[PDB]
C-alpha cells in the first residue's frame, strides 16, 4: 500500500539574533521644584504711628 511520508526529523531551527556591544550612557533624573527669589524684604515698620503718605 504505502503512504507513510516521513518528514526530515533534524531541523535545528532558526532564531533571531542581535549582537550587543559596549556603549556609554548618561543617567539623568528630573525632579520637581519651586522658584524662589534671591532676596525678599518684607518692609515692616520700626516705629509707631499713622501712615500719612
Amino acid at each position: 500500500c504505502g503512504k507513510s511520508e516521513a518528514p526530515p526529523p533534524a531541523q535545528t531551527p532558526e532564531v533571531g539574533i542581535v549582537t550587543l556591544e559596549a556603549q556609554t550612557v548618561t543617567l539623568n533624573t528630573e525632579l520637581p521644584g519651586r522658584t524662589n527669589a534671591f532676596r525678599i524684604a518684607e518692609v515692616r515698620p520700626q516705629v509707631n504711628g499713622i501712615i500719612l503718605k
Binding site: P13, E14, V15, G16
Partner: protein
Amino acid sequence: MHFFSFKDAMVFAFAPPSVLELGNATGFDLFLQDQAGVGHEVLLQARNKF
C-alpha cells in the same frame, strides 16, 4: 501551516468542524481539577508533567 513555521509568533492555524455549534476545533477535551486544596503551583506542575 508549512509557511507559518516562522520565528516570532507560535502561529497555529486550523479549520472548523462540520457542526460549528460543537466547539471550534476537533479532537478530545479534558480538565485536571485540584480537589485537595493544594496550591496553583502544584496543579500547574502537574499539567506540565502531563
